[PDB]
Structure 1
Amino acid sequence: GIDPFTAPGQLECETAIAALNSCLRDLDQASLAAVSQQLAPREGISQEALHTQMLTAVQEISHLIEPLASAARAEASQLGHKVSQMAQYFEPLTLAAVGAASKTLSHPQQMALLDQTKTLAESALQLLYTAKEAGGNPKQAAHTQEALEEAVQMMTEAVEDLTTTLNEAASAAG
């Protein structure tokens, strides 16, 4: 949580990066454990509720992704607020995805949303990474301007992607 740049948000992004990085490892180990029956069935949720929890989070993530993109490039004092929101939704997503991983023995939908959550988490990680650089400061982030764009679009891509598996998982995993 250090500011090597010159703005608010640099802190929030790096602190969230630490948390988001942790969920990446959790998800990555989930896919490894679930593929070897080394994972326990969810944390504390049912099958259709997974579709509920994950989808509800993803939507609100995407909801904040756009305002965060705007914030990361300029809104320094606002960026931190977006980061707080983005990071918090990814936690249940991780939990829920790891849940679906070990719990869903229906179809590849299990591994699909497990991986997609991780993909979206990596998308958000790349997002928080670029947001930490550019946060409120377009100057020391000239090339970061480009990557911040790739990241924001990377999220919305994985957003639709995970959402597909989740929404179908109603009958595809239920």
Structure 2
Amino acid sequence: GIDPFTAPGQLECETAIAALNSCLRDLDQASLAAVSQQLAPREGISQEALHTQMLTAVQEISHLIEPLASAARAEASQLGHKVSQMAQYFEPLTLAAVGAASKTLSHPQQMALLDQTKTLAESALQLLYTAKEAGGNPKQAAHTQEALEEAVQMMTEAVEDLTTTLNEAASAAG
């Protein structure tokens, strides 16, 4: 949580990076954990409620992703507010995804959605990376300006792909 740049948000991004990194590792080892029957069925939720919890979060994530992109490149004081929102939704997503991992076993989409959420949190990690550099400062982030556009487009790529599994999961997981 250090500010090597010159703005508020630099702190928040790096502190969240530590947390997000932790859930990346969990989801990374859960990819091989759920397939080896070494995972316990969800944390505390039902099957259709997974579709509820995850989808509701994802939508609100995307909702804030656009304003965060705008914030990361310029809105320094606002960026931190976006980051707070983005990071918090990913926590239940992780829990819910790990839940679906061990709990769902009907269709092969079980390991498909698990990866769509794994690489989704990874795209969010690279997101807080570029936002940390450019945050409120376009100057010391000349190339970061272009890297931020690669992190935002990488996130929506896994967002639209996840929703495809969620909606089918009504009958594909239910």
Secondary structure of the residue aligned to 1:7 is coil
Tell me the SS of whatever aligns to 1:35. helix
Post-superposition offset of 1:26: 1.1
What is the alpha-carbon distance in structure 1 between the residues aligned to residue 5 and residue 125 of structure 2? Answer: 19
Deviations 1:118-169 (A, max 9, x none): 1110010000111001000011111111110011111111111111111111
CA distance in 2, matches of 1:68, 1:32: 32
TM-score of the two chains, using structure 2 as the length reference: 0.98
Instruction: State the alpha-carbon separation in 2 of the partners of residues 88 and 63 from structure 1.
Output: 14
Q: Which range moved further: 67-76 or 152-161?
A: 152-161
Structure 1 CA distance for aligned equivalents of residues 34 and 52 of structure 2: 21
**Quick one: distance in 2 between partners of 1:125 and 1:108?**
27
CA distance in 2, matches of 1:58, 1:50: 12
User: Displacement of 1:52 after TM fit?
Assistant: 0.4
Map residues 129-140 of structure 1 onto 2, 5 A cutoff. 129-140=129-140
* TM-score, normalised with respect to structure 1: 0.98
* Runs of 4+ deviating beyond 6 Å: none
Match of 2:9 in 1: 9
Unaligned runs of 5+ in 1: none
Q: How many pairs align?
A: 174
Number of the residue aligned with 1:34: 34
Gaps of 5+ in 2: none
Deviation of residue 15 (structure 1)? 0.8
What are the equivalent positions in structure 2 for 1:49-64 lying under 5 Å apart?
Answer: 49-64=49-64
1:141 matched to which residue of 2?
Answer: 141
Once the two structures are overlaid, the 10-residue window that deviates more, 57-66 or 107-116, is 107-116
